[PDB]
Design an enzyme around this catalytic site. Structure first.
Site, PDB file in Angstrom:
ATOM      1  N   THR A  24      21.288  50.500  26.196  1.00  0.00           N
ATOM      2  CA  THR A  24      20.409  51.411  25.454  1.00  0.00           C
ATOM      3  C   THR A  24      20.024  52.611  26.307  1.00  0.00           C
ATOM      4  OG1 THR A  24      19.543  49.647  24.061  1.00  0.00           O
ATOM      5  CG2 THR A  24      18.118  51.549  24.361  1.00  0.00           C
ATOM      6  N   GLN A  96      27.628  46.709  19.484  1.00  0.00           N
ATOM      7  CA  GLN A  96      26.636  45.645  19.650  1.00  0.00           C
ATOM      8  C   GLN A  96      25.650  45.746  18.492  1.00  0.00           C
ATOM      9  OE1 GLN A  96      23.297  45.354  22.531  1.00  0.00           O
ATOM     10  NE2 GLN A  96      24.165  43.370  23.080  1.00  0.00           N
ATOM     11  N   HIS A 177      24.274  40.901  18.862  1.00  0.00           N
ATOM     12  CA  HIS A 177      23.196  40.806  19.846  1.00  0.00           C
ATOM     13  C   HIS A 177      22.342  39.583  19.553  1.00  0.00           C
ATOM     14  CE1 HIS A 177      20.461  41.643  22.915  1.00  0.00           C
ATOM     15  NE2 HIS A 177      20.359  42.955  22.795  1.00  0.00           N
ATOM     16  N   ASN A 180      18.198  38.495  24.789  1.00  0.00           N
ATOM     17  CA  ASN A 180      17.075  39.299  25.275  1.00  0.00           C
ATOM     18  C   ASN A 180      15.881  39.352  24.325  1.00  0.00           C
ATOM     19  OD1 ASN A 180      18.616  39.782  27.540  1.00  0.00           O
ATOM     20  ND2 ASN A 180      19.473  41.659  26.690  1.00  0.00           N
ATOM     21  N   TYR A 182      15.404  39.269  21.083  1.00  0.00           N
ATOM     22  CA  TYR A 182      15.416  39.964  19.802  1.00  0.00           C
ATOM     23  C   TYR A 182      15.516  38.947  18.662  1.00  0.00           C
ATOM     24  CZ  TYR A 182      15.317  44.076  22.670  1.00  0.00           C
ATOM     25  OH  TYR A 182      14.923  45.042  23.562  1.00  0.00           O
ATOM     26  N   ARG A 229      26.570  37.917  22.214  1.00  0.00           N
ATOM     27  CA  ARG A 229      25.912  37.924  23.515  1.00  0.00           C
ATOM     28  C   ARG A 229      24.754  36.931  23.518  1.00  0.00           C
ATOM     29  NH1 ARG A 229      23.330  42.410  27.740  1.00  0.00           N
ATOM     30  NH2 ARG A 229      24.996  41.955  29.224  1.00  0.00           N
ATOM     31  N   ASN A 237      11.166  40.458  26.762  1.00  0.00           N
ATOM     32  CA  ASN A 237      10.425  40.613  25.516  1.00  0.00           C
ATOM     33  C   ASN A 237       9.571  39.384  25.199  1.00  0.00           C
ATOM     34  OD1 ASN A 237      11.202  43.330  24.832  1.00  0.00           O
ATOM     35  ND2 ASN A 237      13.280  42.475  24.681  1.00  0.00           N
TER      36      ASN A 237
END
Ligand SMILES: Cc1cc2nc3c(=O)[nH]c(=O)nc-3n(C[C@H](O)[C@H](O)[C@H](O)COP(=O)(O)O)c2cc1C
Ligand SMILES: C=C(C(=O)O)c1ccccc1
Length: 369
Positions: A24, A96, A177, A180, A182, A229, A237
């Site tokens: 990003t 992604q 994705h 992480n 999300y 991923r 997060n």
């Protein structure tokens, strides 16, 4: 096997095993890739595979400002310029496809709505927003609302249309994705999922959404153009899971049945220690990979986080991994592949220009003579 020799990820042929990890950069105002974005990716097209920056499937899936999406016609056109340029340079690129779930702000959401999540637990996280006057600002992420079953169905349709949009834009495939902290991870991990229906509680229930997303995307574009991923232990997060091994071994056992192109694994805390753990037991990445292989999984095994030249060479030649994805080194070294092949010095990344801004710290890192 050498880091420098070709590989196959499902239907995608890679010229080498050096992958550009998703990064990003917040340089796409209006959620539309632009000409500067095209230069940036074209500079790095000697990578065996580029994974794009996270690209949301919908406005609801946006969590940061100036991130390119897959939900506007203009965005598809902007991505087509990028994939054409990468392909003309002999490269390969996957999108992604992203949904941030609770990691968002009302100002980014349709109708000014609450971000959505499996459960209505606000993240202690920060995001990047744009005010009414156009000024940028950092903000705490907004209070989310819990998804209904019907809402989940609508998101699955958004993953279908996002995968289709990626193919229309000329991508070789997609990386889901599921890392992480999300949306997909919010369903997977215990701290974020307090649901009492078929999407919560047991490991099977917490994995259900991930596997529905995979099956929706694979049905639309083909399992051989679908990767994912995963990040079993990362604290990104504000997320926590005390017992990742049975959870993630189950996930990849199921993914091993699905003829996927690749599995991309973040080893440790994303951007931090490789030996990170949250619960009492260290995560066993060999056991995790064996759960995938022993279930029949034939996808390319792509590893990430903290690799350098010597460790990447050794990990491929030993058979621990099939390919290595580099993040910060690709920010700073457009011709990373040539530098690694020749054992040349690398440029150092400039962290202050990672996010936002313009060409500086984006397209102006030099290649070798
Ligand atoms: C500026 C920046 C942006 C990132 N953006 C994303 C992203 O869009 N998607 C993602 O899955 N990870 C993202 N990451 C994590 C990287 O893909 C990668 O896992 C991390 O940098 C660790 O790898 P490295 O040691 O090779 O840098 C980002 C990391 C950085 C530094
Ligand atoms: C997409 C990201 C991730 O996966 O962590 C991200 C988002 C913003 C800044 C850094 C990374």
């Amino acid at each position: 096997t050498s880091l420098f020799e070709p590989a196959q990820a499902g239907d995608i042929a890679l010229a080498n095993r050096i992958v550009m990890a998703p990064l990003t950069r917040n340089r796409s105002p209006g959620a539309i890739p632009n000409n500067l974005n095209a230069t940036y990716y074209e500079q790095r097209a000697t990578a065996g595979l580029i994974v794009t920056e996270g690209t949301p499937i919908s406005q609801q899936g946006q969590g940061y400002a100036d991130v390119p999406g897959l939900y506007k016609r203009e965005a598809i056109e902007g991505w087509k310029k990028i994939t054409d340029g990468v392909h003309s340079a002999g490269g390969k690129i996957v999108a992604q496809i992203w949904h941030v779930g609770r990691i968002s702000h009302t100002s980014l959401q349709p109708h000014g709505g609450q971000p959505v999540a499996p459960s209505a637990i606000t993240a202690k996280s920060k995001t990047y927003i744009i005010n009414d006057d156009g000024t940028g600002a950092f903000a705490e992420t907004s209070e989310p609302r819990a998804l209904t079953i019907d809402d989940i169905g609508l998101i699955l349709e958004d993953y279908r249309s996002g995968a289709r949009a990626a193919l229309e834009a000329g991508f070789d495939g997609v990386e889901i994705h599921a890392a992480n902290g999300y949306l997909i991870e919010q369903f997977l991990k215990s701290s974020t999922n307090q649901r009492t229906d078929d999407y919560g509680g047991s490991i099977e229930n917490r994995a259900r959404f991930l596997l529905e997303v995979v099956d929706a995307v694979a049905e639309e574009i083909g399992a051989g153009r679908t990767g994912i991923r995963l990040s079993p232990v990362t604290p990104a997060n504000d997320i926590f899971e005390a017992d990742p091994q049975p959870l993630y071994n189950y996930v990849v056992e199921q993914l091993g049945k699905r003829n996927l192109a690749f599995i991309h694994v973040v080893e440790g805390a994303t951007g931090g220690p490789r030996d990170f753990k949250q619960g009492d037991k260290p995560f066993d990445y060999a056991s995790f990979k064996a759960a995938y292989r022993n279930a029949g999984g034939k996808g390319l095994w792509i590893a990430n986080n903290g690799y350098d030249r010597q460790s990447a060479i050794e990990a491929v030649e030993s058979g621990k991994v099939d390919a290595v994805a580099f993040g910060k080194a690709f920010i700073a070294n457009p011709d990373l592949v040539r530098r690694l092949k020749n054992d040349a010095p690398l440029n150092a990344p400039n962290q202050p220009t990672f996010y936002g801004g313009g060409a500086e710290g984006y397209t102006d890192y030099p290649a070798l003579a």
